[PDB]
Amino acid sequence: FSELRNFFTGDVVIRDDPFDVWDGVKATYIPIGVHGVRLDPNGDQPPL
Amino acid sequence: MSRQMWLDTSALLEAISEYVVRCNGDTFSGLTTGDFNALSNMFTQLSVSSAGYVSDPRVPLQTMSNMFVSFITSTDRCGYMLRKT
């Protein structure tokens, strides 16, 4: 009988409490920080 | 006029020089340089007559020197600048 058992012996490992699974998330981004006044780099443009 | 008015204009002409020096050999085809922008605008401020883009900045700069020599020579004209006040 021993051999018959040892053949039919195989282990498995399972987590006691199932994982809690969620759905995806809409990655929404919002603004942050304060903006100051940036002046044009070239200055007044040539005429005509 | 005012001594101040002369200095101010000198400073302008003296500035035009500065930028002419800056723009020398830096005037390329597709570029727009803050320097050339300044220069071309200053070329405008000279002549009370007109304000169109100066295609040849030599012209007005010349007319100005000429007008000046012709002024600074005749004591009847530039006399007022020789007063104590």
d(C-alpha B35, C-alpha B26), whole Å: 9
Instruction: Please tell me whether residue A28 adopts helix, strand or coil conformation.
Output: coil
CA distance B4 to chain A (A): 26
Distance of CA B66 to the CA centre of its chain: 12
* N-term to C-term CA, chain B: 12
- What is the structure's resolution, reported in angstroms to one decimal? 3.5
Q: If you ran DSSP here, which 8-state letter would residue A38 be given?
A: -
Cβ–Cβ under 8 Å, residues A48 and B53:
yes
What interhelical angle do B58-73 and B34-46 show, nearest 10? 40
Q: How far apart are CA B57 and CA B41, in angstroms?
A: 11
Tokens 């699974």, residue? Answer: A21
Contact B58, B46 (CB under 8 A): no
Write out the two tokens for B65: 């020197």
DSSP secondary structure, B35-47, as one string = HHHHHHHHHHHH-
Q: Which of B22, B33, B37, B46 to mutate to test the interface with A (most CBs of A within 10 A)?
A: B37
- Torsion-angle region of residue B50: left (phi > 0), alpha (psi -120 to 50) or beta? left
The whole-angstrom separation of Cα B32 and Cα A41 is 11
Structural contact between residues B21 and B38, judged by C-beta atoms closer than 8 angstroms: no
